[PDB]
């Protein structure tokens, strides 16, 4: 169940919180 | 049918002391008539082309055997009620068995549906089934792109229409994104066009470019055919940049248009916490980033307002718990903007928007868990932010509930 | 002729049953709405039949008011020659 | 009852209810089964083993039941394979005699063809100048007609009924794709114009009395423009309308229903003209003749009547079936009527003498669709077993079997050339079959050892979105039309 | 669901009619099975003057029924038609509203306008256009 | 329920897989209507024979005297084949060439002036 395909999709495993740009300078 | 049900019927009628051979004689006669009618009601089901055996099939099967489809009542004179049926009654076993006679009058009648019309379409074009919505679904060789020329003509035209030069062009392109069944296998190029666009479109804060891309995201989401959570990772950052990042253009004016886009962004954020949900990955991750945006000190009031909008549209249980303890930091921030004379910055506008949103959200949270008693000065125990105006908002909500 | 003089006074007088509902069950049997006053007589003749049963079931409820039951409909329809059935299920 | 064949399961549960005598005295299907004789076509190589086990007096009573209740029709052949016996059985009084399928059938078209009947055999109506004007514009459509074959697969235009919350029970299209009729469960017939030309009624008798005659345009001066819709609803049946049939001159809609009447609706006045009351029982189908005078209607009373639109009483009663006459189809020369039925037999009936000239058995369920080849030499039948059986008419051997469909095959049609047979079923699929490679090969034994050519004869399947294909029609330029009532 | 709303828009209008006829000089708060009984006798009564007055006019070679076909239809159901002008002029007479229409917007679709491809000569112009 | 679960087995023994939920409710309403008209007639026949107990011959009489009137059938095969050969012997009539719209006599058609009341 930890081998389910979703676990490995990079939305559930990645730093997209950094991709959010606050004050583009 | 069982014979021990036939003796119950006989002794509840006045015919007592019936033998078993007398009682077995009843249950093979009536079980034949049920078998004779259900075989005869299957004729009406097979010529009605419905394979259902509706309740009306037994009404015509009874009339065919010269028995009244009258049920629950039998008229020995036949003149008042002939072989026309009374469609029985709506039945449930779990009924109340007693209603008030003015409850049935005051309920609204159901809508009569549309009449039958004749529309034509195409199942096959010279052998091939079209994908219209009326249809269900040593040198290595020079490779070909996985899109067709036309599959990508659609793309170039849809992307050049979705940058919103003309509004009717946008709206069709958005509906085309919202219901094209073959829009999978083009979806990487759409997700990359969105993601890449917002990041080089916040370098200069171009609000339309962003409002059009957020509408493209919303049009991508409500399409039922395509599989989106493989492109889920890019979704949280692209919407969030429009809602909470600073505005390189003018924060004071275009903020209202920015706010229409802000509402679109919160709706997509709620979709992210509504769809695509697995254990502790998506909703809790954006909730944690929103809360550390809030606990952030001296944050761009544009970002602060965006973080507040994000934490506010998360549903019923989220807002009540999250706002509860903050009932002092928000007030202190408002007081600082008020005291410092600086008016040519965007701090004052950001403060007014944040306070209005926080107050309006508080009114349902207060209206939701507690009676509307002492709506005059009890809110002064919560620093007196919305007070009687908050009470008036709660009263308007109560009036809407009464109308419902 | 009273009944001809009666039907000529039915351009007004919306009855208790609507003509969109009386006309629906008439269209189900082939009767089509040529004259809307013709529908209102059939809607009046079907009211008077139900009203005469509810007025006679009230007399069988005063001897034993305030609730219409199946044991009031049973002797009320028995003079009509109609044996009503209890669900018994 | 447990050691019976699996395709008799709906037949035995009617018998499990029958336990008394008076229960069977009012069934009228088992009452006619008890008095008739099961035909039971057997070979002479197997009948010698049977008669050597029955002529002895050791058994002497099951032999008495056999020679009282069972016919035995013997034929000379090589023994059929189990999958060949399975192809031609399944009917009560099954596998009829070869002496029934040896009568001379005039299966040719009218105008030399030796298989064609004379023009004065059946008294067919005259060809008027307005009917001769129809065939002039019909051959302009034949000019644009494409040769379909296995390569140029036709385009299918599905005419779905979208709302249809009254259940659609009958569709017909005119021979030129101009009108589409719909029989519905709310006891209505609804005519739709599909060309951009609204449905007009002719003017009233006061308006026709003031206009003149022989103006050489009077077929336009009489059409009322005050009444012009894209839809005309026809009321008058007291029951769900099960049959729908246009006349070839595009007047005279026919409809039959549960109330036991066949109705002739005009398409110039859009009223009802005649109500043909011969059945007391649901008339399951009706069809006009391809020349437009006679029509045949089959009902629940196990007969099919031949009417003529001039008499209140029928002319021929085709009364040999043992169950409901589900389908009634005319031959392209209109001298023969094919009546499929619920006792799993298809029977051809000569219009002269009312005699059954062919009996086609081999379906496992009630036959719900028949069509003729445009040659007149073949007949495709479909039933609830999902099998499309292709029968010869001069021979009567059903040379082919198409077994692609899953549920009840409710619509069949051949192409205008005869190149493709189109099949529509309750599987929501429109399958196309090669109707040239199916008849390429075409006795003294009564069978041809038909192969499993179904995979080779498939050209396409065309799954439909939740919509059972009630009708299939071929435009004169060889374009498939279908109508479904989306569920 | 608009499928069962084809039947329930008119049968639940007959439920308001019986609830309005059992209140006129009569009841409040009736039993539930007694209301679905009486509105089943009401639907079966409209459907019986539908089938019998159509039968009486078509027996006389006509297609739409006059007044003389219903005053013989109601006689054959035992109605005593003369009491009906007095019933129509009640002061307790009420009107039950007709049911609402599902397609309230009527025309709310902007649509998707795409044209490509023509027709081969075996397809006339009145069939739908080939898609994009 | 007890008697409603047996009704779903009578339909499943007849191969009826799909049916409306109101189908079971009104076959039970017919089965109740049928047994309270056999037993109602059974005690009428018992009072005719003057016995205080309704025994099995009373129900045997009330079944076969209700099945003689209620449940009819289509006409039998020896009756259909006799009226066929009486009808199929008559030869087909010839057709007049320009009679017009071919219809029965006007007392057998539905084509009359079809009047209506004057609105006043």
Q: What are the residue ranges of helices labelled H in B162-282? A: 167-179, 187-200, 207-221, 232-244, 255-274
Which is nearest to E21 in space by CA: E38, E40, E43?
A: E38
- Nearest C-alpha in E relative to D165: E3
Domain at D38, CATH number: 2.130.10.10
Name which of E121, E123, E126 is nearest D155 (Cβ-Cβ): E123
Separation in Å, CA of E38 to nearest CA in chain C? 8
How far apart (Å, rounded) are the C-alpha atoms in residues B2 and D95? 41
Closest Cα in chain A, distance from residue B233 (Å): 4
D159·B120 Cβ contact <8 A? yes
Per-residue DSSP letters for D363-374? -SS-EEEEEE-T
Q: Which residues of B fall within a CB distance of 8 Å from F10?
A: 31, 34-35, 38
Q: Which residues of D421-447 are buried (b: 16+ CB within 10 A; e: fewer)?
A: bbbbbbbbbbbbbbbbebbeeeeeebb
User: Which of D149, D164, D477 would you mutate first to test chain E, the one with the most E CBs within 10 A?
Assistant: D477
Q: Which of F6, F21, F27, F32 to mutate to test the interface with C (most CBs of C within 10 A)?
A: F32
Q: Which of B347, B348, B357 is nearest to B311 (CA)?
A: B357
Q: What contacts D270, CB < 8 A, 6 or more positions away?
A: D191, D199, D201, D227, D232, D234
- Per CB-CB distance under 8 Å, the chain D contacts of C30 are 187, 235-238
Minimal-distance CA residue of chain C relative to F37: C83
Angle of helix B316-326 versus helix B347-368 axis, rounded to 10: 120
Rounded to whole angstroms, how far apart are CA atoms B107 and E100? Answer: 12
| Interchain CB distance below 8 Å, B113 and E47 | no
Q: Which helix (H) or strand (E) holds D68?
A: helix D62-69
| Residue in D224, D450, B388, B51 with CA at minimum distance from that of residue F20 | B51
Angle made by CA atoms E60, E62, E63, in degrees to the nearest 5: 140
Taking the CA atoms of chain D, what radius of gyration do you get in angstroms?
24
Give CA angle at E15 (E11, E17), nearest 5°.
Answer: 110
- Which of D191, D195, D159 lies closest to D176, judged by CA? D195
Contact of B16 with F21, CB cutoff 8 Å = no
> In D353-456, where do the E strands start and end?
356-361, 367-372, 378-383, 388-392, 400-402, 409-414, 420-425, 430-434
Residue F110: closest C-alpha in chain E: E61
Q: Which of F25, C73, B59 is nearest to E18 (CA)?
A: C73
With touching defined as 3 or more inter-chain CB pairs under 8 Å, the answer for chains C and F is yes
Three-state DSSP state, D161? strand
Alpha carbons F39 and B8: distance in angstroms, whole number: 12
As a whole number of angstroms, the distance between CA D285 and CA C79 comes to 45
Among residues D5, D1, D3, the alpha carbon closest in space to that of D91 is found at D5
**DSSP tag of B346:** S
Q: Do E61 and F117 touch (CB under 8 A)?
A: no
Note whether B350 and B305 are within 8 A (CB): yes
How many helices and strands, by DSSP H and E, does chain A display? 0, 0
Give D446→chain F minimum CA distance, Å: 29
How was this structure determined? It was done by cryo-EM
How many CA atoms lie less than 13 Å away from B392 in the CB half-sphere?
A: 4
**Dist. CA F88–CA D316, nearest whole Å:** 6
Would you say the C-alpha torsion D309, D314, D315, D317 has a positive or negative sign?
Answer: positive
Q: What is the DSSP letter of D405?
A: -
Tally of domains in chain F: 1
Is residue D324 within 8 Å of D342, Cβ to Cβ? yes
Which chains sit next to F, with 3 or more Cβ pairs under 8 A? B, C, D, E
- The token pair that represents B308 in the structure block: 């507040």
Touching subunits of E (3+ CB pairs, under 8 Å) are B, C, D, F
Which residues in E have their CB inside 8 Å of a CB on F? 58, 60-64, 66-67
- CATH code linked to domain B3-65: 1.10.20.10
Which of F6, F23, F38 lies at the smallest CB-CB distance from B55?
A: F23
Asked if B355 has any chain A CB less than 8 Å from its own CB, the reply is no
- B207 interaction partners in chain A (CB closer than 8 Å): none
Single out the residue of B109, B85, D185 nearest to residue E45, CA to CA: B85
Q: Do chains D and B touch (3 or more CB pairs under 8 A)?
A: yes
Return the residue of F nearest to C36 by Cα: F119
Cα separations in angstroms, D260 against D105, D239, D283, D369: 32, 9, 6, 21
Strands D231-235 and D261-265: unpaired
Chains near A (3 or more Cβ pairs under 8 Å)? B
Exposed/middle/buried for residue E95 (C-beta within 10 Å: 0-12, 13-18, 19+): middle
| Residue of chain B nearest C21, judged by CA positions | B112
Provide the Cα torsion D241, D244, D247, D248; round to 10°.
170
Is C69–E48 a contact, with Cβ atoms under 8 angstroms apart?
Answer: no
Give the Cα separation of D241 and D243 in Å (integer): 6
Token reading at B321: 């718990």
Does A23 sit within 8 Å of B245, measured CB to CB? Answer: yes
Burial class of residue B208, CB neighbours in 10 A (0-12, 13-18, 19+): middle
Residue D368, phi then psi, degrees to nearest 5? -115, 5
Neighbours of B114 (CB within 10 A): 14
Q: Nearest-CA neighbor of D480 among D408, D427, D431, D428?
A: D431
Confirm or reject contact between E29 and chain C (CB < 8 A): yes
Distance from the Cα of F115 to chain C's closest Cα (Å) equals 12
**Yes or no, beta carbons of F109 and E58 under 8 Å apart:** no
As a whole number of angstroms, the distance between CA B291 and CA B311 comes to 8
Q: Under 8 Å CB-to-CB from B372, ≥6 apart: which residues? A: B391, B394, B395, B398
CA distances from residue C3 to D62, E12, E67, E81, E89 in whole angstroms, order as listed: 75, 31, 10, 8, 13
Could you tell me the residue range of the domain that residue D48 belongs to?
1-100
Q: Using an 8 Å CB-CB cutoff, list chain C residues near E94.
A: 16
Q: How far apart are CA B361 and CA B359, in angstroms?
A: 5
Minimal Cα distance from B93: which residue of C? C89
Which residues of chain C make contact with F119, given a CB cutoff of 8 A?
Answer: 8, 35, 37
- Answer whether D328's CB lies under 8 Å from D296's CB: yes
């Amino acid at each position: 169940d930890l081998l389910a395909d979703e676990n490995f999709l990079m939305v559930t495993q990645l730093h997209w919180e950094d991709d959010i740009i606050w004050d583009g300078e | 049918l069982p014979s021990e049900s036939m003796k119950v019927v006989a002794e509840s009628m006045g015919i007592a002391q019936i033998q078993e051979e007398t009682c077995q004689l009843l249950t093979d006669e009536v079980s034949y008539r049920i078998k004779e009618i259900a075989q005869d009601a299957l004729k009406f089901m097979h010529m009605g082309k419905r394979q259902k055996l509706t309740t009306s099939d037994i009404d015509y099967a009874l009339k065919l055997k010269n028995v009244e489809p009258l049920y629950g009542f039998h008229a020995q004179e036949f003149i008042p009620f002939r072989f026309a049926s009374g469609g029985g009654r709506e039945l449930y076993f779990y009924e109340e068995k007693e209603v008030d006679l003015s409850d049935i009058i005051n309920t609204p009648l159901p809508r009569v549906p549309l009449d039958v019309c004749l529309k034509a379409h195409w199942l096959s074009i010279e052998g091939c089934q079209p994908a219209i919505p009326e249809n269900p679904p040593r040198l290595k060789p020079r490779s070909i792109h996985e899109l067709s020329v036309e599959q990508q003509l659609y793309y170039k035209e849809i992307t050049e229409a979705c940058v919103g030069s003309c509004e009717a062009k946008r709206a069709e392109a958005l509906q085309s994104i919202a219901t094209d069944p073959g829009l999978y296998q083009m979806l990487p190029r759409f997700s990359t066009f969105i993601s890449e666009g917002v990041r080089v479109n916040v370098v200069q804060n171009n609000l339309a470019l962003l409002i059009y891309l957020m509408r493209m995201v919303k049009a991508l989401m409500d399409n039922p055919t395509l599989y989106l959570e493989k492109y889920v990772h890019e979704l949280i950052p692209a919407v969030m940049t429009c809602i909470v990042s600073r505005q390189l253009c003018l924060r004071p004016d275009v903020d209202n248009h920015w706010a229409l886009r802000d509402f679109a962004a919160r709706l997509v954020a709620q979709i992210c916490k509504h769809f695509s949900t697995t254990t502790n990955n998506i909703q809790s991750r954006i909730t944690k980033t929103f809360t550390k945006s809030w606990v952030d000190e001296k944050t761009p009031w544009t970002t602060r307002y965006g973080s507040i909008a994000g934490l506010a549209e998360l549903g019923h249980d989220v807002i009540k718990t999250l706002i509860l303890p903050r009932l002092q930091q928000e007030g202190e921030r408002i007081r600082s903007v008020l005291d410092g004379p600086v008016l040519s910055n965007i701090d004052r506008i950001g403060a007014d928007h944040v306070q209005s949103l926080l107050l309006k959200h508080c009114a349902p949270v207060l209206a939701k868990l507690r009676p509307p008693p002492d709506n005059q000065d009890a809110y002064r125990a919560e620093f007196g932010s919305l007070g009687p105006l908050l009470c008036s908002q709660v009263v308007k909500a109560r009036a809407q509930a009464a109308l419902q | 002729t009273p009944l001809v003089d009666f039907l000529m006074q039915l351009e007004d007088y919306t009855p208790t049953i609507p003509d969109a509902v009386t006309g629906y069950y008439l269209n189900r049997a082939g009767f089509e709405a040529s004259d809307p006053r013709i529908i209102r007589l059939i809607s009046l003749a079907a009211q008077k039949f139900i009203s005469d049963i509810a007025n006679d079931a009230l007399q069988h409820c005063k001897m034993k008011k305030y609730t219409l039951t199946m044991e009031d409909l049973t002797p009320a329809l028995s003079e009509y020659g109609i044996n009503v059935k209890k669900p018994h299920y | 009852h447990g050691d019976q064949e699996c395709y008799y399961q709906d037949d035995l549960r009617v018998l499990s209810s029958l336990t008394k005598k008076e229960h069977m005295k009012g069934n009228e299907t088992m009452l006619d089964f008890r008095t008739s004789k099961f035909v039971l076509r057997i070979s002479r190589d197997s009948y010698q083993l049977l008669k050597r086990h029955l002529q002895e007096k050791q058994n002497n009573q099951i032999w008495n039941i056999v020679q009282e209740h069972l016919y035995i029709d013997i034929f000379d052949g090589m023994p059929r394979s189990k999958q060949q016996i399975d192809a031609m059985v399944g009917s009560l009084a099954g596998e009829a005699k070869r002496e029934a399928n040896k009568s001379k059938v005039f299966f040719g078209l009218l105008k030399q063809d030796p298989n064609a009947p004379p023009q004065n055999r059946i008294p067919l109506p005259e060809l008027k100048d307005s009917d001769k004007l129809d065939k002039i514009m019909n051959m302009k459509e034949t000019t644009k007609r494409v040769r379909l074959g296995p390569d140029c697969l036709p385009s299918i235009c599905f005419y779905t009924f979208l709302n249809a919350y009254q259940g659609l029970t009958a569709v017909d299209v005119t021979d030129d794709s101009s009108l589409i009729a719909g029989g519905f469960a709310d006891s209505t017939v609804r005519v739709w114009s599909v060309t951009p030309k609204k449905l007009r009624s002719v003017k009233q008798a006061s308006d026709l009395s003031l206009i003149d005659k022989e103006s050489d345009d009077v077929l336009e001066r009489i059409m009322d423009e005050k009444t012009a819709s894209e839809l005309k609803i026809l009321y008058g049946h007291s029951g769900p309308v099960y049959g729908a049939s246009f006349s070839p001159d595009r007047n005279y809609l026919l409809s039959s229903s549960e109330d036991g009447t066949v109705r002739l609706w005009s398409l110039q006045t859009f009223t009802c003209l005649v109500g043909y009351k011969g059945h007391n029982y649901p008339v399951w189908d009706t069809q006009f003749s391809p020349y437009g005078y006679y029509f045949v209607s089959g009902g629940h009373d196990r007969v099919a009547r031949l009417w003529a639109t001039d008499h209140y009483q029928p002319l021929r009663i085709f009364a040999g079936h043992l169950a409901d006459v589900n389908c009634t189809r005319f031959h392209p020369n209109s001298n023969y009527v094919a009546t499929g039925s619920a006792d799993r037999t298809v029977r051809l009936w000569d219009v002269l003498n009312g005699n059954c000239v062919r009996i086609f058995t081999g379906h496992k369920g009630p036959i719900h669709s028949l069509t003729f080849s445009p040659n007149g030499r073949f007949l495709a039948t479909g039933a609830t077993d999902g099998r499309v059986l292709l029968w010869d008419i001069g021979h009567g051997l059903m040379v082919g079997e198409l077994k692609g469909h899953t549920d009840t095959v409710c619509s069949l049609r051949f192409s205008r050339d005869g190149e493709i047979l189109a099949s529509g079923s309750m599987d929501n699929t429109v399958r196309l079959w090669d109707a040239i490679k199916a008849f390429e090969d075409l006795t003294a034994t009564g069978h041809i050892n038909l192969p499993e050519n179904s995979q080779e004869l498939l050209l396409g399947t065309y799954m439909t979105k939740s919509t059972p294909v009630v009708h299939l029609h071929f435009t004169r330029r060889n374009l498939v039309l279908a109508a479904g009532a989306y569920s | 669901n608009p499928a069962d709303n084809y039947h329930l828009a008119r049968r639940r209008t007959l439920q308001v009619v019986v609830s309005s006829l059992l209140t006129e000089a009569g009841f409040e708060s009736a039993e539930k099975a007694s209301v679905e009984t009486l509105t089943e006798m009401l639907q079966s009564y409209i459907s019986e003057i539908g089938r019998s007055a159509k039968s009486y006019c078509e027996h006389t070679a006509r297609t739409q029924p006059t007044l003389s076909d219903i005053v013989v239809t109601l006689v054959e159901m035992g109605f005593n038609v003369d009491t009906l002008p007095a019933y129509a002029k009640r002061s307790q007479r009420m009107v039950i509203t007709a049911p609402p229409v599902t397609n309230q917007p009527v025309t709310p679709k902007a649509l998707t306008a795409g044209q490509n491809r023509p027709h081969p000569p075996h397809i006339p112009s009145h069939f739908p256009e080939f898609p994009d | 329920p007890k008697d409603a679960q047996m009704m779903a087995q009578i339909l499943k023994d007849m191969g009826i897989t799909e049916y409306e939920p109101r189908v079971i409710n009104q076959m039970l309403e017919f089965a109740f209507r049928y047994v309270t008209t056999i037993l109602d007639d059974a005690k009428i026949y018992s009072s005719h024979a003057k016995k205080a107990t309704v025994d099995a011959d009373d129900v045997r009489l009330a079944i076969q005297c209700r099945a003689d009137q209620s449940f009819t059938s289509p006409p039998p095969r020896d009756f259909l084949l006799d009226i066929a050969r009486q009808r199929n012997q008559t030869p087909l009539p010839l057709i007049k060439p320009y009679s017009g719209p071919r219809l029965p006599p006007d007392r057998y058609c539905l084509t009359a002036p079809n009047y209506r009341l004057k609105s006043l």
